Amino acid sequence: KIEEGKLVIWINGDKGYNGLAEVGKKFEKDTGIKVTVEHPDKLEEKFPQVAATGDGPDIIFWAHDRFGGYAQSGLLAEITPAAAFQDKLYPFTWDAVRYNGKLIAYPIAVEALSLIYNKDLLPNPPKTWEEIPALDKELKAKGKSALMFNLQEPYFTWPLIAADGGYAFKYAAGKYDIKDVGVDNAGAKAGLTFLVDLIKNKHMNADTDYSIAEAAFNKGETAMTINGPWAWSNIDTSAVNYGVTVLPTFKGQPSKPFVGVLSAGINAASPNKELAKEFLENYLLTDEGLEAVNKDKPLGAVALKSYEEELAKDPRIAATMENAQKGEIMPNIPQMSAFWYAVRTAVINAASGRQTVDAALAAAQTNAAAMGVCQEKSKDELEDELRKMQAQMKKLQEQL
Amino acid sequence: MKIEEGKLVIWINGDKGYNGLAEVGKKFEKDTGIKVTVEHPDKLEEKFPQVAATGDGPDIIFWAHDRFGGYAQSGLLAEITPAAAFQDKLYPFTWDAVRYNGKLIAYPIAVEALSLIYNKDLLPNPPKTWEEIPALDKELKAKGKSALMFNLQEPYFTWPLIAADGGYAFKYAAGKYDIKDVGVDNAGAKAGLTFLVDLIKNKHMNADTDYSIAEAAFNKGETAMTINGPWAWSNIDTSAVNYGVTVLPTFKGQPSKPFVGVLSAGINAASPNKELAKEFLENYLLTDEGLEAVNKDKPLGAVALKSYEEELAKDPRIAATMENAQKGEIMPNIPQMSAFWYAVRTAVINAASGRQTVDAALAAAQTNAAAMGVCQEKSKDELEDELRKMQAQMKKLQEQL
Amino acid sequence: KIEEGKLVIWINGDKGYNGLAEVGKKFEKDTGIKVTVEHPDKLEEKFPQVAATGDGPDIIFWAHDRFGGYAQSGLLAEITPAAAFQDKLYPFTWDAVRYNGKLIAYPIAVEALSLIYNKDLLPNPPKTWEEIPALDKELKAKGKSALMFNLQEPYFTWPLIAADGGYAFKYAAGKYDIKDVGVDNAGAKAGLTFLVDLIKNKHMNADTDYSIAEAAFNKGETAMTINGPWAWSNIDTSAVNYGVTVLPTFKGQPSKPFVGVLSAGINAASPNKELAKEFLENYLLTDEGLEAVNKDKPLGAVALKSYEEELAKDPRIAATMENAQKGEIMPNIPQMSAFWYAVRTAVINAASGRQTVDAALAAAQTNAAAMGVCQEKSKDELEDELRKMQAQMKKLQEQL
Ligand SMILES: OC[C@H]1O[C@H](O[C@H]2[C@H](O)[C@@H](O)[C@@H](O)O[C@@H]2CO)[C@H](O)[C@@H](O)[C@@H]1O
Ligand SMILES: OC[C@H]1O[C@H](O[C@H]2[C@H](O)[C@@H](O)[C@@H](O)O[C@@H]2CO)[C@H](O)[C@@H](O)[C@@H]1O
Ligand SMILES: OC[C@H]1O[C@H](O[C@H]2[C@H](O)[C@@H](O)[C@@H](O)O[C@@H]2CO)[C@H](O)[C@@H](O)[C@@H]1O
């Protein structure tokens, strides 16, 4: 059950949810309809579970890559923007939320990873990944490190993997070929090998996550990090004088980050579809709406032409757009769940030394494609559950 | 039941005329000295493949033809080789229903299709459309009655509504089924199931209603209509209800499309009595006298035997049965039908009970019906069930300390 | 994990590991590099688990059928022999270790099963399988038996199954069709049915394994066995006067043994790749090298042309090559593991009487052409683990 006459919206905890809530306050002030903004953990996984039961938020925010899966699973309502409203947003952002001929979400903003560097610590950032090892050695002598970024989410290491030729699904003849996966070719192998070598050579730690990497950079312990626009706000609050720039090259090739369009989908089971449309079209996707969210945590290059004309003047947004141009807009196909899970497992296993880069990537190629009932994620969850049950069994055998 | 030589053990579903079939068995025993045992175990369609795979089970198994391609593919059925003269006694289309990869793998017995069964005293003019059923129920509720009750636990009964406006199992093209093209989640399938769920949401039907409850309600004059096959008419006759058998209601102006079954008799690949089974089936069951004995117990539908069917076809209930069959389709017999049926069974039950939305339930069913295999939906369900049970046992055990 | 400046080699326990170590000793005297030969149990399964973690031997020996799987999994280095060396080996043996255009191992020897018979007990061996039951009935009256061979490994029963039409994967239109499996056709079924009838009629025991059959033949208790060239050494040391000959026919058709090419692969994670190449090319694959291995346990028909010209004069080798010519060289494709596991399970289940031949083979056809993550083997392991956990629960409930 979803309460009628109210809007519940879910958005990730790294985004400007407090700003989104202000927009909700304006909506409530004009209409009397309460808006509740929440940022639950494991959002992208939680939504498909509750939505399938007819429960969950009225509106779900995530990058566009998950939306095809949601739509295929019967979880999203088709959105019906009139022509005039569709002209307010960039066409390519609409393309990102089109699934099987139908618009399945409202595009909000374009996200791409950039290299973020400490200006005082490193006035001239490296153009290549190759020179990072020597840079780190010099900084260790000063009690610092070259680079820390999230190694637990494949999103962040993907630009290096794609740099020299790695790809997700081959786009051929108007479609993605789910039988043609590129996570195990020579370029992908070379990219991940470099990451793993950085860790082998004590220039990076395999255990480093989002939180640890952010804290190290914002406290001035590391000279560089890799992140998107949402992260700039916390860096501002800290004392670090930072620049946002083009990602380093690898083997002479640009890093190719996967570009995301933060998007707003409407729960198929919502009894407030028309309120959701009004909130999204008449309140959020306006100059005042996006500004409020942006002021909280920066959105990137927004989908709304009128407000983007302002943000484009920002050099950090230019760097963001340069990096996006060098990458590719993510597919939204249902198979993106398997791809992301496969690559997540490979990077983590290779980085920790449990699998070689080659073994890990060969397995990722297999898992990214395809099947359904017994996916890699499912087998892993089962094996974890069995281990947990075994543990309980031993503690019970002990008390017997 | 490690299949004794020199005896016949027969399995048939409990809704069928097993007592009548036993009379045929008795006649067989008097002529040949070979004892025939007819049994009707619960869940036989699932029990047969399990026990037959070990060389156990009945010599002869009765079920609608849709399960038989799977049985045959799994190596459980003997190939049937009737002489030309015998094969000519049965309609060719009924033989098509039991032909798998060029081989006959059962004897066809009878054609089954669902019809709308209505109480003439309670409802002299039955509804032509599903759409007018809510208002009909509203009138009948005021008299302490209801419009319609039928088995909502078996997707067989709900499939006619789902298929009405465009739902399908596997796409038929160029002479074969494309098992990668499943149609349980298109606009028509979704519209049909949504209508059913809306019937439940608006309290015109109850999600818990099963076969025995719907039958009792109709035969007691408590509900104006039910949906059932010919095997059901016998108990209605016995109840004395003034009933008619008629065309299913339309949905969105389109006929309901029941999946039609051909009741069939297969021979266990492991039976050491294959010749006795053949003789029983050809020279005893598939005669005018044989089928009549079964039919007198529970009606078979339109039988496969030409000579006996020319007599039955004159019955208006059989004409209605054939009209509904023509509006539906004879089921595929391909191995993938068990996955299809299980997928739809889960979807209908989950949506009717409110556990899943109609759209989520059918989208997963579309996925599950096309599951290549080794890890099927059913196996996944059984695994999850087994784990929760073990978790439950541990919770009770930790509690005891 | 893998020591640099040293070589560790793994080879199966039935092969001439002592003889290979002698080659290892010769390598060490000339180069100063220590060579360690090991024969761990369950080598074919143990290698991919340890190699995937960057551990294991530098060199792995096994028949070529598993190598495509090892290579697909990213466990094998491409070998770089160069033209002149390749000319020393038969072209068809190079074909056996070529995977997706690359050489992924060095071929060593061609192995095929033969009929091995006691000349004193049975001076004229049966030409057909059909005449074996009557032979056993005659021999049992003398306190002996006609035939015992390993019934636990599908390798040994495969020749009978393939005789009348059974096949693994159809080689059609230039490639193996993993969707066209032939273990459930009329020929496969007729072949397995005959085997099961032998057992039902007490001419054989379903539990008979490699060790039991070998001991039975070498103690003069059974008149015939089925084995490869490796087994002759132990027979020589026994008192049995034996002959090696063409396998019996079935329904007028030759038995079709699956032919293996014993091969040496190089662990992708090895830091001694150059040492391994020099070892394999300049020490093992020479006349003295192979002869040293051969004297310990016979290799069969070797891949090195110069030494085979010698071995070919041996009538036992002529028999081996006659049977090999009547069979087919195994595919090396990754799918061969599902195939072997599928068939292993079918033969055992049918032979034991737990399933009918038709049910077991029909299920094998399905398993051999599996998907990806949920293989038959995984399911079996899952079921095994559940049964154990269930047993523990009953044992705890028993304690009250
Ligand atoms: O790491 C895999 C993950 O990458 C992307 O998620 C991003 C998201 O797009 C950003 O807005 C930000 O929150 O970082 C996330 C990574 O932690 C994909 O959108 C997501 O589907 C995928 O699983
Ligand atoms: O509900 C799924 C079920 O439908 C059919 O079973 C019918 C059967 O054909 C009729 O003779 C009668 O007994 O009712 C059954 C439904 O309860 C399919 O034949 C069967 O395979 C399928 O599971
Ligand atoms: O039995 C299945 C098994 O057969 C082959 O293994 C052979 C091997 O090739 C021989 O060299 C010798 O050691 O006997 C083995 C049988 O026990 C296949 O090569 C192997 O992949 C397969 O599992």
Side-chain angles (χ1 to χ4, degrees), chain C residues 12 14-15 44 62-65 111 113 150 152-156 210 227 230 258 260-262 330 336-337 340-341:
Chain C
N12 206 43
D14 53 351
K15 309 298 194 284
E44 17 34 67
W62 196 261
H64 71 288
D65 60 302
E111 305 172 352
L113 292 171
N150 188 4
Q152 307 312 300
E153 285 289 344
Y155 186 68
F156 291 83
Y210 187 92
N227 226 324
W230 55 85
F258 243 154
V261 178
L262 180 68
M330 288 189 277
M336 286 299 292
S337 48
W340 277 129
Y341 192 84

Short mmCIF file of all heavy atoms in Angstrom, two decimals, chain C residues 12 14-15 44 62-66 111 113 150 152-156 210 227 230 258 260-262 330 336-337 340-341 344, ligand 3, unseen atoms left out:
data_model
loop_
_atom_site.label_atom_id
_atom_site.label_comp_id
_atom_site.label_asym_id
_atom_site.label_seq_id
_atom_site.Cartn_x
_atom_site.Cartn_y
_atom_site.Cartn_z
N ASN C 12 49.20 -36.16 -13.76
CA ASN C 12 48.33 -37.15 -13.13
C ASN C 12 49.06 -38.36 -12.57
O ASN C 12 50.10 -38.75 -13.09
CB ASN C 12 47.26 -37.61 -14.11
CG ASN C 12 46.01 -38.10 -13.41
OD1 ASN C 12 45.53 -37.48 -12.45
ND2 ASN C 12 45.45 -39.20 -13.89
N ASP C 14 48.66 -41.50 -12.68
CA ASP C 14 48.76 -42.71 -13.50
C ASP C 14 49.84 -42.59 -14.59
O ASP C 14 50.17 -43.57 -15.28
CB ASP C 14 47.39 -43.11 -14.10
CG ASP C 14 46.70 -41.96 -14.86
OD1 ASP C 14 47.19 -40.81 -14.79
OD2 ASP C 14 45.66 -42.21 -15.53
N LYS C 15 50.40 -41.39 -14.73
CA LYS C 15 51.44 -41.13 -15.73
C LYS C 15 52.82 -41.30 -15.12
O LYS C 15 52.96 -41.55 -13.93
CB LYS C 15 51.29 -39.72 -16.33
CG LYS C 15 49.89 -39.40 -16.84
CD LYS C 15 49.52 -40.33 -17.97
CE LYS C 15 48.28 -39.85 -18.73
NZ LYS C 15 47.03 -40.10 -17.97
N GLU C 44 42.63 -32.38 -12.39
CA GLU C 44 41.81 -31.62 -13.33
C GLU C 44 40.91 -30.60 -12.67
O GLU C 44 40.67 -29.55 -13.26
CB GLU C 44 40.94 -32.51 -14.23
CG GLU C 44 40.69 -33.98 -13.82
CD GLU C 44 40.59 -34.26 -12.32
OE1 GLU C 44 39.62 -33.79 -11.68
OE2 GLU C 44 41.50 -34.96 -11.80
N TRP C 62 47.58 -32.43 -18.65
CA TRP C 62 46.32 -33.14 -18.71
C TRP C 62 45.99 -33.39 -20.17
O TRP C 62 46.62 -32.80 -21.06
CB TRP C 62 45.20 -32.36 -18.03
CG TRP C 62 44.05 -33.24 -17.77
CD1 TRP C 62 42.91 -33.35 -18.52
CD2 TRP C 62 43.92 -34.19 -16.70
NE1 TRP C 62 42.08 -34.31 -17.98
CE2 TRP C 62 42.68 -34.84 -16.87
CE3 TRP C 62 44.74 -34.55 -15.62
CZ2 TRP C 62 42.23 -35.84 -15.99
CZ3 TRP C 62 44.28 -35.54 -14.75
CH2 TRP C 62 43.04 -36.17 -14.94
N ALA C 63 45.03 -34.26 -20.44
CA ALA C 63 44.55 -34.45 -21.80
C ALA C 63 43.96 -33.12 -22.26
O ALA C 63 43.45 -32.35 -21.45
CB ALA C 63 43.50 -35.55 -21.85
N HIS C 64 44.01 -32.88 -23.57
CA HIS C 64 43.67 -31.57 -24.13
C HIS C 64 42.20 -31.16 -23.97
O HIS C 64 41.88 -29.99 -24.14
CB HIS C 64 43.99 -31.56 -25.62
CG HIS C 64 43.06 -32.40 -26.42
ND1 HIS C 64 43.10 -33.78 -26.39
CD2 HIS C 64 42.06 -32.07 -27.26
CE1 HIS C 64 42.15 -34.26 -27.18
NE2 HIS C 64 41.52 -33.24 -27.73
N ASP C 65 41.31 -32.10 -23.68
CA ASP C 65 39.89 -31.75 -23.67
C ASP C 65 39.52 -30.67 -22.65
O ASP C 65 38.59 -29.91 -22.86
CB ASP C 65 38.99 -32.98 -23.51
CG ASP C 65 39.24 -33.72 -22.21
OD1 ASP C 65 40.39 -34.14 -21.98
OD2 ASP C 65 38.28 -33.91 -21.43
N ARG C 66 40.29 -30.58 -21.56
CA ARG C 66 40.01 -29.59 -20.53
C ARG C 66 40.67 -28.25 -20.81
O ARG C 66 40.41 -27.27 -20.10
CB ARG C 66 40.49 -30.11 -19.16
CG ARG C 66 40.04 -31.54 -18.87
CD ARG C 66 39.28 -31.70 -17.56
NE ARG C 66 37.86 -31.38 -17.70
N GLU C 111 46.65 -40.54 -26.72
CA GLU C 111 46.18 -41.63 -25.87
C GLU C 111 44.84 -42.14 -26.38
O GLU C 111 43.95 -41.35 -26.67
CB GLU C 111 45.96 -41.14 -24.44
CG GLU C 111 47.14 -40.45 -23.76
CD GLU C 111 46.76 -39.83 -22.43
OE1 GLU C 111 45.56 -39.80 -22.09
OE2 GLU C 111 47.67 -39.36 -21.71
N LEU C 113 42.04 -45.70 -25.60
CA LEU C 113 41.79 -46.97 -24.92
C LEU C 113 41.92 -48.14 -25.89
O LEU C 113 41.63 -48.02 -27.08
CB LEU C 113 40.40 -46.98 -24.29
CG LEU C 113 40.17 -46.02 -23.12
CD1 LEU C 113 38.69 -45.97 -22.74
CD2 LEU C 113 41.01 -46.46 -21.93
N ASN C 150 37.10 -49.86 -15.38
CA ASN C 150 36.62 -48.75 -14.57
C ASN C 150 35.22 -48.26 -15.01
O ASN C 150 35.06 -47.69 -16.08
CB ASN C 150 37.62 -47.60 -14.64
CG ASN C 150 37.30 -46.48 -13.68
OD1 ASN C 150 36.36 -46.56 -12.88
ND2 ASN C 150 38.06 -45.40 -13.76
N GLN C 152 33.48 -46.09 -13.13
CA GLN C 152 33.20 -44.83 -12.43
C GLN C 152 33.53 -43.61 -13.27
O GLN C 152 33.12 -42.50 -12.95
CB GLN C 152 33.95 -44.76 -11.09
CG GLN C 152 33.74 -45.95 -10.17
CD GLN C 152 32.28 -46.33 -10.03
OE1 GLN C 152 31.46 -45.53 -9.58
NE2 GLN C 152 31.93 -47.55 -10.43
N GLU C 153 34.29 -43.81 -14.34
CA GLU C 153 34.72 -42.71 -15.20
C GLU C 153 34.17 -42.94 -16.59
O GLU C 153 34.47 -43.95 -17.23
CB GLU C 153 36.26 -42.61 -15.24
CG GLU C 153 36.93 -42.00 -13.97
CD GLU C 153 36.68 -40.49 -13.83
OE1 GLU C 153 36.26 -39.84 -14.80
OE2 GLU C 153 36.94 -39.94 -12.75
N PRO C 154 33.37 -41.99 -17.08
CA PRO C 154 32.66 -42.15 -18.35
C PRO C 154 33.61 -42.35 -19.53
O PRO C 154 33.21 -42.89 -20.55
CB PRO C 154 31.88 -40.82 -18.48
CG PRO C 154 32.64 -39.85 -17.63
CD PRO C 154 33.17 -40.66 -16.48
N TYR C 155 34.86 -41.92 -19.39
CA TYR C 155 35.91 -42.17 -20.38
C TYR C 155 35.95 -43.62 -20.84
O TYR C 155 36.14 -43.90 -22.03
CB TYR C 155 37.27 -41.80 -19.76
CG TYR C 155 38.47 -41.86 -20.69
CD1 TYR C 155 38.60 -40.96 -21.73
CD2 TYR C 155 39.48 -42.80 -20.49
CE1 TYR C 155 39.71 -40.99 -22.57
CE2 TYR C 155 40.60 -42.83 -21.31
CZ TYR C 155 40.71 -41.93 -22.35
OH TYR C 155 41.81 -41.96 -23.18
N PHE C 156 35.76 -44.54 -19.90
CA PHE C 156 35.93 -45.96 -20.17
C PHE C 156 34.70 -46.61 -20.79
O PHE C 156 34.81 -47.61 -21.51
CB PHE C 156 36.34 -46.68 -18.89
CG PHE C 156 37.73 -46.33 -18.42
CD1 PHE C 156 37.96 -45.19 -17.68
CD2 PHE C 156 38.81 -47.13 -18.74
CE1 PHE C 156 39.25 -44.86 -17.26
CE2 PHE C 156 40.09 -46.81 -18.33
CZ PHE C 156 40.31 -45.67 -17.58
N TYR C 210 38.87 -47.99 -11.13
CA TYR C 210 40.13 -48.15 -11.81
C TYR C 210 41.00 -49.14 -11.05
O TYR C 210 41.52 -50.10 -11.61
CB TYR C 210 40.86 -46.82 -11.95
CG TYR C 210 42.11 -46.92 -12.82
CD1 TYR C 210 42.05 -46.68 -14.18
CD2 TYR C 210 43.35 -47.29 -12.27
CE1 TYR C 210 43.16 -46.78 -14.99
CE2 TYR C 210 44.48 -47.39 -13.08
CZ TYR C 210 44.37 -47.14 -14.44
OH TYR C 210 45.46 -47.22 -15.28
N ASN C 227 41.88 -50.21 -21.01
CA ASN C 227 42.79 -49.25 -20.40
C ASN C 227 43.67 -48.59 -21.45
O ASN C 227 43.61 -48.96 -22.62
CB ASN C 227 43.66 -49.94 -19.34
CG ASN C 227 43.74 -49.14 -18.06
OD1 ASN C 227 43.77 -47.91 -18.09
ND2 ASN C 227 43.73 -49.82 -16.93
N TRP C 230 49.31 -46.14 -20.40
CA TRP C 230 49.87 -45.94 -19.05
C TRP C 230 49.80 -47.20 -18.17
O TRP C 230 50.64 -47.42 -17.30
CB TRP C 230 49.17 -44.78 -18.34
CG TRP C 230 47.68 -44.92 -18.28
CD1 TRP C 230 46.95 -45.61 -17.35
CD2 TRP C 230 46.73 -44.36 -19.20
NE1 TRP C 230 45.61 -45.52 -17.65
CE2 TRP C 230 45.45 -44.76 -18.78
CE3 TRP C 230 46.85 -43.57 -20.35
CZ2 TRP C 230 44.29 -44.40 -19.47
CZ3 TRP C 230 45.70 -43.22 -21.03
CH2 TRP C 230 44.44 -43.63 -20.59
N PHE C 258 37.09 -41.93 -27.17
CA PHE C 258 37.43 -40.53 -27.27
C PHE C 258 38.94 -40.43 -27.12
O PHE C 258 39.52 -40.91 -26.14
CB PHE C 258 36.69 -39.73 -26.20
CG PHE C 258 35.72 -38.73 -26.75
CD1 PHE C 258 34.63 -38.31 -26.01
CD2 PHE C 258 35.90 -38.20 -28.03
CE1 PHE C 258 33.74 -37.39 -26.51
CE2 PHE C 258 35.02 -37.26 -28.54
CZ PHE C 258 33.93 -36.86 -27.78
N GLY C 260 42.52 -38.78 -26.57
CA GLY C 260 43.12 -37.65 -25.88
C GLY C 260 44.55 -37.37 -26.31
O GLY C 260 45.32 -38.29 -26.60
N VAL C 261 44.89 -36.09 -26.34
CA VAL C 261 46.28 -35.68 -26.53
C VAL C 261 46.79 -35.11 -25.21
O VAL C 261 46.43 -33.99 -24.83
CB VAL C 261 46.40 -34.61 -27.64
CG1 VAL C 261 47.83 -34.15 -27.80
CG2 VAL C 261 45.85 -35.16 -28.95
N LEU C 262 47.62 -35.88 -24.53
CA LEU C 262 48.21 -35.42 -23.29
C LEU C 262 48.96 -34.13 -23.59
O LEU C 262 49.75 -34.08 -24.55
CB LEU C 262 49.17 -36.47 -22.72
CG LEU C 262 49.88 -36.15 -21.40
CD1 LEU C 262 48.88 -36.10 -20.26
CD2 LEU C 262 51.00 -37.15 -21.10
N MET C 330 38.93 -35.82 -29.00
CA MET C 330 38.05 -35.03 -28.15
C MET C 330 38.03 -33.56 -28.56
O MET C 330 39.06 -33.01 -28.95
CB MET C 330 38.46 -35.15 -26.68
CG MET C 330 38.15 -36.50 -26.07
SD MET C 330 38.38 -36.57 -24.28
CE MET C 330 40.13 -36.86 -24.13
N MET C 336 33.03 -29.11 -22.56
CA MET C 336 33.38 -30.52 -22.34
C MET C 336 33.27 -30.92 -20.89
O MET C 336 33.09 -32.10 -20.58
CB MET C 336 34.80 -30.84 -22.84
CG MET C 336 34.94 -30.91 -24.35
SD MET C 336 33.90 -32.19 -25.08
CE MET C 336 34.67 -33.68 -24.47
N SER C 337 33.41 -29.97 -19.98
CA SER C 337 33.26 -30.33 -18.57
C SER C 337 31.79 -30.64 -18.23
O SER C 337 31.52 -31.62 -17.55
CB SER C 337 33.87 -29.29 -17.64
OG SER C 337 33.47 -27.99 -17.99
N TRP C 340 31.16 -34.10 -19.74
CA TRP C 340 31.72 -35.21 -18.97
C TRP C 340 30.98 -35.45 -17.67
O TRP C 340 30.72 -36.59 -17.29
CB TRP C 340 33.20 -35.00 -18.69
CG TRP C 340 34.10 -35.41 -19.80
CD1 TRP C 340 35.10 -34.66 -20.36
CD2 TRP C 340 34.12 -36.67 -20.48
NE1 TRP C 340 35.72 -35.37 -21.34
CE2 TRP C 340 35.15 -36.61 -21.44
CE3 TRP C 340 33.36 -37.84 -20.37
CZ2 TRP C 340 35.44 -37.67 -22.29
CZ3 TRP C 340 33.65 -38.89 -21.21
CH2 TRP C 340 34.68 -38.80 -22.17
N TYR C 341 30.67 -34.38 -16.96
CA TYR C 341 29.93 -34.51 -15.71
C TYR C 341 28.53 -35.10 -15.96
O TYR C 341 28.05 -35.95 -15.20
CB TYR C 341 29.82 -33.18 -14.99
CG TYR C 341 29.32 -33.35 -13.59
CD1 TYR C 341 30.20 -33.67 -12.55
CD2 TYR C 341 27.97 -33.23 -13.30
CE1 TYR C 341 29.75 -33.85 -11.25
CE2 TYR C 341 27.51 -33.41 -12.00
CZ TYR C 341 28.41 -33.71 -10.98
OH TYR C 341 27.94 -33.88 -9.70
N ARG C 344 29.03 -38.83 -16.78
CA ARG C 344 29.49 -39.51 -15.57
C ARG C 344 28.30 -39.85 -14.68
O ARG C 344 28.14 -40.98 -14.23
CB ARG C 344 30.47 -38.61 -14.82
CG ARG C 344 30.94 -39.12 -13.46
CD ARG C 344 31.73 -38.03 -12.71
NE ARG C 344 33.09 -37.85 -13.23
O1 LIG D 3 36.20 -39.95 -17.44
C1 LIG D 3 36.10 -38.58 -17.75
C2 LIG D 3 37.48 -38.04 -18.08
O2 LIG D 3 37.98 -38.71 -19.23
C3 LIG D 3 39.26 -38.22 -19.63
O3 LIG D 3 40.22 -38.38 -18.59
C4 LIG D 3 41.11 -39.47 -18.76
C5 LIG D 3 42.45 -38.94 -19.22
O4 LIG D 3 42.32 -38.30 -20.47
C6 LIG D 3 43.47 -40.07 -19.33
O5 LIG D 3 44.73 -39.48 -19.56
C7 LIG D 3 43.50 -40.96 -18.09
O6 LIG D 3 44.14 -40.30 -17.03
O7 LIG D 3 42.19 -41.33 -17.68
C8 LIG D 3 41.27 -40.29 -17.47
C9 LIG D 3 39.95 -40.94 -17.08
O8 LIG D 3 39.91 -41.30 -15.71
C10 LIG D 3 39.15 -36.76 -20.01
O9 LIG D 3 40.40 -36.28 -20.45
C11 LIG D 3 38.72 -35.98 -18.78
O10 LIG D 3 38.61 -34.60 -19.06
C12 LIG D 3 37.39 -36.53 -18.30
O11 LIG D 3 37.00 -35.89 -17.11
#
